Amino acid sequence: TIKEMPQPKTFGELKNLPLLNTDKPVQALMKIADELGEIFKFEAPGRVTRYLSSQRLIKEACDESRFDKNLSQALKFVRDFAGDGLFTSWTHEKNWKKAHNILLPSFSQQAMKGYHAMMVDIAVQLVQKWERLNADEHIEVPEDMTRLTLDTIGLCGFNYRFNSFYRDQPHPFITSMVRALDEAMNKLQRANDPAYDENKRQFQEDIKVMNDLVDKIIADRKASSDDLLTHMLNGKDPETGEPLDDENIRYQIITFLIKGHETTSGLLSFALYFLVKNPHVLQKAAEEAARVLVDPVPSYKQVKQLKYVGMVLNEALRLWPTAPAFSLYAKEDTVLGGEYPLEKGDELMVLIPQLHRDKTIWGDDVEEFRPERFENPSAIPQHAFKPFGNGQRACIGQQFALHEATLVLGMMLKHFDFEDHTNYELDIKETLTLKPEGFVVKAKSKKIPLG
Numbered sequence: 460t461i462k463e464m465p466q467p468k469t470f471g472e473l474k475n476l477p478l479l480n481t482d483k484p485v486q487a488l489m490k491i492a493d494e495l496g497e498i499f500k501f502e503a504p505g506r507v508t509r510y511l512s513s514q515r516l517i518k519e520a521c522d523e524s525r526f527d528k529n530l531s532q533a534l535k536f537v538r539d540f541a542g543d544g545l546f547t548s549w550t551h552e553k554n555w556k557k558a559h560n561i562l563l564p565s566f567s568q569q570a571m572k573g574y575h576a577m578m579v580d581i582a583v584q585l586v587q588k589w590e591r592l593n594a595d596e597h598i599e600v601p602e603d604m605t606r607l608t609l610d611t612i613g614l615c616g617f618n619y620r621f622n623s624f625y626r627d628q629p630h631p632f633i634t635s636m637v638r639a640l641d642e643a644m645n646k647l648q649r650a651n652d653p654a655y656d657e658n659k660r661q662f663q664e665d666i667k668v669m670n671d672l673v674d675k676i677i678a679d680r681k682a683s684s685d686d687l688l689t690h691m692l693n694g695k696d697p698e699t700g701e702p703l704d705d706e707n708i709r710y711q712i713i714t715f716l717i718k719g720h721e722t723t724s725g726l727l728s729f730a731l732y733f734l735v736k737n738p739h740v741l742q743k744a745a746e747e748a749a750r751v752l753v754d755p756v757p758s759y760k761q762v763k764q765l766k767y768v769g770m771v772l773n774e775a776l777r778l779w780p781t782a783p784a785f786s787l788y789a790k791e792d793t794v795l796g797g798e799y800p801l802e803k804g805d806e807l808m809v810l811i812p813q814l815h816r817d818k819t820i821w822g823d824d825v826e827e828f829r830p831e832r833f834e835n836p837s838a839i840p841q842h843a844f845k846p847f848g849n850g851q852r853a854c855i856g857q858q859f860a861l862h863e864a865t866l867v868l869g870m871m872l873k874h875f876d877f878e879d880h881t882n883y884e885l886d887i888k889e890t891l892t893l894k895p896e897g898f899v900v901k902a903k904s905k906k907i908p909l910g
């Protein structure tokens with residue numbers, strides 16, 4: 460029957476805000492979830508949401524007849540630069556369904572097979588960097604994974620070479636992206652001011668940097684292909700018959716550059732992190748790579764054969780889903796879990812890391828890294844594993860990401876032995892998305908030739 464919704468302690472007008480005075484808000488929220496359970500309300504001056512953590516409640520929230528995708532305050536802040544592209548558009552916005560239809564063919568297996576060779580180009584450039592390090596040297600993992608994933612989406616999506624591996628510091632686009640994402644995150648924990656005038660002005664500067672690349676890409680395709688850029692330029696929605704106007708296209712370039720690389724990078728960092736911490740898992744994933752990748756460079760089918768590598772990727776997404784949250788709103792008045800009445804417009808947040816720790820679904824060893832959980836995935840209940848969102852608003856890039864990751868991890872495992880030389884202590888940085896900050900390793904080459 461009509462239950463009272465749990466809520467953390469409120470502090471007069473501050474509401475629940477003093478509890479999220481942190482650079483790690485998602486990890487803080489996980490703490491409040493362990494304390495209060497599957498659902499809690501959370502209020503901040505002028506705004507309210509409900510955090511869900513259980514499969515039973517998230518199953519219901521994922522019913523698209525009752526709840527649609529919502530733009531959390533965080534995505535509202537990012538919509539300041541990504542506009543009405545795929546990721547920051549409302550489902551009822553014209554350009555959502557339209558860009559969806561227009562851009563979907565770029566993620567068909569047909570197109571996926573055509574991306575493979577460009578993926579290998581960047582993968583090799585990674586392996587070669589590591590082959591060429593001197594003995595006194597180590598690898599900065601999130602940093603190099605970011606070089607790979609940015610370059611990969613640049614080449615596959617846009618035929619643009621970011622040449623991230625010819626730069627010892629991050630590409631200029633990355634530095635702006637990261638400072639902007641951080642700022643959208645800082646903006647959330649501010650109750651109300653001319654104290655934030657510089658943050659607003661760096662925020663506009665960070666946007667212009669990003670946009671400067673867009674024009675560069677736009678002008679490169681111009682001044683001279685069947686890819687994402689192509690369909691953005693030529694494609695027409697098989698419904699309305701209309702193409703995307705110039706303004707939307709620029710929003711899509713930006714959308715894809717960011718979303719098209721950052722969460723994949725975090726996944727590869729975490730996966731490698733868990734491998735070097737779980738040496739019996741590493742050995743087994745390294746056995747699979749040596750056996751399957753019998754060629755100097757990997758083929759498309761061989762990547763498909765790397766089954767245990769895929770299990771490792773999925774298990775790493777279970778523990779640390781790199782886009783750790785997605786928001787929903789009630790299309791109409793409704794009752795949630797048969798106990799929580801909700802009003803048209805009310806917001807729900809899906810705390811994916813808590814979902815992935817639901818013991819009633821996963822058992823009592825949720826913190827353990829066990830790729831074998833995914834041995835036969837059809838066994839896993841529906842809506843229990845959701846690192847790619849839900850329904851028609853799920854990740855469009857899912858298979859792209861996993862193909863990229865599996866290929867790259869497979870080659871890593873084939874070509875090197877990794878050492879956790881600083882006995883790295885997990886430290887998860889939040890820029891809305893998640894990554895293990897400061898993760899470093901040593902890779903000793905197995906001295907196996909590339910093709």
Ligand code: HEM
Pocket residue numbers: 528545546559612714715718719720722723726780781782784785786846847848849851852853854855856857859860
């Ligand atoms: C492990 C890697 C990835 C993860 C965990 C991930 C996660 C997600 C999540 C959770 C959403 C839903 C957001 C929400 O409901 O508010 C989403 C949507 C989206 N993703 Fe991914 N992503 C990954 C890689 C990629 C890649 C490689 C691309 C492009 C090549 C991409 C492009 C997009 C786009 C455009 C959307 C918006 C889709 C729509 O609403 O139409 N993502 N992703």
